[PDB]
RNA sequence: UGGGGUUAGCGCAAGCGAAGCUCUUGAUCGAAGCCCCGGUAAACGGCGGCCGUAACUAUAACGGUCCUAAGGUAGCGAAAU
């Protein structure tokens, strides 16, 4: 939650169009659907009045004020079956339903997040030292080099 | 209102031109209707895309977007591609 006021004035080139679009150009960081849900939440004021109809036609000469909240990967505790661990290489047996790289929808609970929790400063190496990808539905051995010179030798070996 | 035709007359003429009549452009009056606003879907109708995730767990529901008003609720799935 990041409660920051957002007030802006609509120009004269948004004539005859709806509410979701008008806030979109003036606020590039937030798109139509993100704007749409907050409109339905009765937390956006137009001309000092709250609106309930996103399909309204607004042209100009209006002061819209959004008074609401706004908002790398947080590590999570995941059980990992360590096979071999030392100062240069890390051999891990990846269990079932565990993806090696988080995406849009899995901020925490992956191999990279678990490795962050397992060793905090592991974020120094790119991609937390993973060299090859593997499907989450498939279990098997995964190799991670602890030190960054080992990263260069490993990627060159696969080439 | 404007213009044209005709002519009592004014002009030794070219022409102009009173009144009346006529033809034509058409200012003001001019509502409905058309749009416009809010409802009306047991009215006619519509409930789709583009990127990426698992879920194929007991029930099939979760994110990020288009220029759309809106993306399928339960029910039942091998269905109409």
Shortest CA distance to A40 belongs to which of A55, A62, A23, A59? A55
**Dihedral-angle region of residue A35 (phi above 0 means left; psi in -120 to 50 means alpha; beta otherwise):** alpha
Known catalytic residue at A86: no
Shortest CA distance to A108 belongs to which of A84, A81, A73? A73
Within 7 A of a protein CB, which nucleotides of strand B?
A: 37, 52-56, 62-71
Residue closest to B52, CA→C1'?
A: A104
How many angstroms separate the CA of A102 from the C1' of B53? 9
Q: Answer whether A154's CB lies under 8 Å from A90's CB.
A: no
> Which runs of consecutive H residues, i.e. helices, occur in chain A?
19-26, 32-40, 111-118, 148-158
d(CA A90, CA A108): 21
- Give the max Cα distance, chain A: 67
Structure-token pair, residue A65: 């004020």
How many angstroms separate the CA of A58 from the C1' of B2? 50
Q: Is the Cα torsion angle A147, A75, A37, A22 positive or negative in sign?
A: negative
Gyration radius (Cα) of chain A, Å: 24
Per the residue annotation, which of A29, A52, A135, A137 is the catalytic one? A135
- Architecture of the CATH domain A3-69: Roll (3.10)
Residue closest to B70, CA→C1'?
A: A55
How many angstroms separate the CA of A130 from the C1' of B38? 61
Residue A81: partners with Cβ closer than 8 Å, 6 or more residues away: A92, A93, A95
Q: Answer whether A2's CB lies under 8 Å from A71's CB.
A: yes
Residues 35-94 of A with CB under 7 A from strand B: 36, 54-55, 57
d(CA A56, CA A59): 10
Side-chain-side CA neighbours of residue A146 (13 Å): 12
């Amino acid at each position: 939650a990041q409660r920051v006021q957002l007030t802006a004035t609509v120009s004269e080139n948004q004539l005859g169009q709806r509410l979701d679009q008008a806030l979109a150009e003036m606020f590039p960081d937030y798109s139509r659907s993100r704007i749409k849900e907050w409109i339905l939440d009765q937390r956006v004021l137009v001309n000092g009045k709250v609106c309930d109809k996103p399909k309204e036609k607004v042209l100009g000469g209006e002061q819209v004020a959004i008074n609401a909240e706004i908002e790398r990967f947080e590590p999570q505790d995941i059980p990992l079956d360590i096979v071999y661990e030392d100062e240069d290489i890390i051999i891990i047996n990846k269990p079932r339903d565990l993806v090696v790289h988080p995406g849009a929808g899995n901020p925490d609970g992956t191999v990279l997040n678990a490795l962050l929790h397992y060793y905090p400063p592991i974020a120094d190496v790119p991609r937390a030292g993973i060299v090859h990808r593997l499907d989450k539905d498939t279990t098997g051995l995964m190799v991670v080099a602890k030190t960054v010179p080992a990263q260069t030798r490993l990627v060159e070996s696969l080439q």
